[PDB]
Amino acid sequence: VNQKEIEIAIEYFKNYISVGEIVATMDLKARGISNPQAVISKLIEMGIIEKGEGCYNLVR
């Protein structure tokens, strides 16, 4: 996973806070991330976000 893409995704979730999975995928693709699922999964590992039921939430 590319580090610039990680930073792009972190800034996205910092702004949106709680995002449905399909929206997040489309929005990250628009921001130039060809494989958002890999970047999302990395952010979950890092503890930046966590998954609900089809939603991603920024950890406070």
TrEMBL record:
Domain of life where this protein originates: Archaea
Protein known as: Uncharacterized protein
Organism from which the protein derives: Saccharolobus solfataricus
Whole-protein coverage range: 11 to 70 of 76
